[PDB]
């Protein structure tokens, strides 16, 4: 492990953490409205949504119906996706911080030992 490399990965995953957390709330806000519009509707990275319906795919009443269900399900899966995504990101960060601190201490100890030895040989 190299502190320079660890620091790099730390920053990137930290970015992804913020980004993901953001998208989560954004989609959640949409889902909030969607859940409410779900009532009037039935009066007539987004998780496994596209693939799911894709591996099955290949008037106005029904079209509007499905369309309204699409947005909802999409925001649902996306919200849950990003939710867990940021959670995973956070864990990955803490793990890297621990490995970082280990490399950090090791580095100091190594150099210091090399100095002591070098001196204790004159």
């Amino acid at each position: 492990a190299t502190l320079k490399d660890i620091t790099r990965r730390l920053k990137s995953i930290k970015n992804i953490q913020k980004i993901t957390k953001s998208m989560k709330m954004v989609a959640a806000a949409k889902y909030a409205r969607a859940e409410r519009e779900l009532k009037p509707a039935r009066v007539y990275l987004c998780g496994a949504i596209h693939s799911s319906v894709a591996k099955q795919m290949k008037l106005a009443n029904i079209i509007y119906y499905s369309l309204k269900e699409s947005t909802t399900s999409e925001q649902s899966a996306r919200m849950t996706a990003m939710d867990n995504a940021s959670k995973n990101a956070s864990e990955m960060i803490d793990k890297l911080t621990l490995t970082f601190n280990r490399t950090r201490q090791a580095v100091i100890t190594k150099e210091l030992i090399e100095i002591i030895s070098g001196a204790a040989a004159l």
Binding site: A32, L98, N101, R104, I108, T109, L112
Partner: protein
Amino acid sequence: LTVAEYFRDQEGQDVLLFIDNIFRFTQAGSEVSALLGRIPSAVGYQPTLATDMGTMQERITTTKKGSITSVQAIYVPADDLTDPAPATTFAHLDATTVLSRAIAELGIYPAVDPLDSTSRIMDPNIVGSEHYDVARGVQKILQDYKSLQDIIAILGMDELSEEDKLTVSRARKIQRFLSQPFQVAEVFTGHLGKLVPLKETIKGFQQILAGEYDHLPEQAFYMVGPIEEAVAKADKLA
């Protein structure tokens, strides 16, 4: 420590020793050790890190005369708790008080984070069952409310079930009931300082959790001492 030892070993008092800070105590040690020509151990700390720390901490104890409790300010180098210095210090700590600026910004003074600050003696076979469960309830209600913090400004503070709406209010009441006017602030904020005894502290939050005061404004439980004062304040708020 010696100045404090006197009172304990002579007058049998319960002295309070403040060490600000403990990290600089260890650093001074590594330095002295270095000057004496001792080979530095991990991360450059003195080999006698264990003893140097131990001997000093061991004097801070309770005897059959008095006691010496030490509030030591801690500095975690590189925010690394596994680093030798803090790693060693933690081996002699019994409790922690994390002063969080965020809490201070919310106006909660003292700014003691009610989720980080922990104590080992906070065990039923020590602080008692009642105290333990009451303390637990406070920590739990606050955690639950924290979980809802997100949903609040997302789905809308109304979709929450009765219990959730109750936990929110109660948690906020408790959160506020955590602030206490210090006598030191008397010669500044112009407010009488309070010395809330452990009994009233337990009973107070115990009642809040029971919801016995679910009818009083949250502000009533802000910067007050015994729960009784909060009640009176509520009446003043009308």
